[PDB]
Each structure stands twice: as C-alpha cells, then as structure tokens.
Ligand binder design. Structure first.
Ligand SMILES: OC[C@@H]1CC2(CCCCC2)CN1c1ncnc2[nH]ccc12
Length: 167
C-alpha cells in the first residue's frame, strides 16, 4: 500500500493519471521519481526543466558535478542521483531523441532502467522535444517495465486518448 491517489490501473504493474509529475512528486514524495533527461543532464524544459526548477536548481548543480566526474550518459541509459525536495532519489533516464535521428529501439532500453527499482513515479519517455509518439511510448512501457510504475501524463487530451486506446 502506497500514497499514490487517483491512478487508473492499466495492467498488473502499470498505473496512469492525468497529472504534472512535479506536483505528484511534491505531494507523494515517492522513493523514486524519473526524470526524462538528455545525455548531458542539462535540465532545460519539459519534465527536466520543471523538476529542476522545483529543486531551486539544486538538481542542476548536482548534475553538473556528476557530469564532471563521470562524463555523459548513453542514450537509453540512466543514473541515480538525489531527489532533493521532491523524492528520495531521482532516476535520470535518457530516451532516444527521434528529432536527433536517434534509434526508437533505444526507448525499450531506456524503460529497462525502471526494472532496477521496485516502485517509481515516472513520465512517458521520449515525448516532447524528443519527438516520439506518446501512444507508442506507453506500449513500450507496458511491455518492458515489470516493477510498479505510476505514470503522470501532463496533457489531458493525450491522457484521455491514451486511456481510451489499445485492444
Ligand atoms: O512525456 C513527457 C511529457 C510530455 C510533455 C507535455 C505534453 C506534450 C509534450 C511535452 C511534458 N511531459 C510531462 N509529463 C508529466 N509531468 C510533466 N510536468 C512538466 C512536464 C511534464
């Protein structure tokens, strides 16, 4: 039993809500919040820019020190850093940027990182500036993640359509 509220159950382990992941994190303070990162951990916009702003830029400061020590992430890869005032931990995951020509197959690799954590609050990966169809990203998530994932979908029209979809 956890403190997530109002989620629609999609499968045994996948749940979804029309919500801003930042507000969900502030209210729930989950163990893990997923950031939709780029390989440089430059948190400019979308999920990453909004999460970082909610940490008063502490996420960016920590991330710059991580890059200085370790270099960039791989597309499809991840790292665990602090969750600051939003969560215990933040799992920074890099989905492929289809607008950069990056291979959509890397979206499955990106979601595989979620399986290292028992419970996560997460966005749909590779949407926004990365240009992947969120309908597709949900299918990959359901078919890849085996741990318990709570998906916060910002866009109402998109959420309304995602939950009214499939087979
Ligand atoms: O898949 C990531 C989605 C896609 C996005 C919004 C809808 C159209 C394109 C860009 C931003 N994302 C978010 N998802 C959940 N919480 C969020 N808080 C701030 C941003 C955000």
């Amino acid at each position: 039993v956890n403190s997530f509220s109002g989620y629609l159950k999609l499968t045994d382990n996948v749940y979804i809500k029309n919500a801003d992941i930042v507000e969900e994190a502030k209210k729930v303070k989950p163990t893990v919040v997923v950031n939709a990162a780029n390989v440089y951990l430059k948190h400019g916009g979308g999920v990453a820019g909004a999460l970082n702003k909610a940490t008063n830029n502490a996420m960016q400061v920590e991330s710059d020190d991580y890059i200085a020590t370790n270099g960039p992430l791989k597309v499809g890869g991840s790292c665990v850093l602090s969750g600051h005032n939003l969560a215990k931990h933040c799992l920074h995951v890099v989905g492929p940027n289809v607008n950069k020509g990056e291979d959509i197959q890397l979206l499955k690799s990106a979601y595989e990182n979620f399986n290292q954590h028992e419970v996560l609050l997460a966005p749909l990966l590779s949407a926004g500036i990365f240009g992947a169809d969120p309908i597709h990203s949900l299918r990959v998530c359901v078919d890849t993640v085996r741990t318990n994932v709570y998906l916060a979908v910002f866009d109402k029209n998109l959420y309304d359509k995602l939950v009214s979809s499939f087979l």
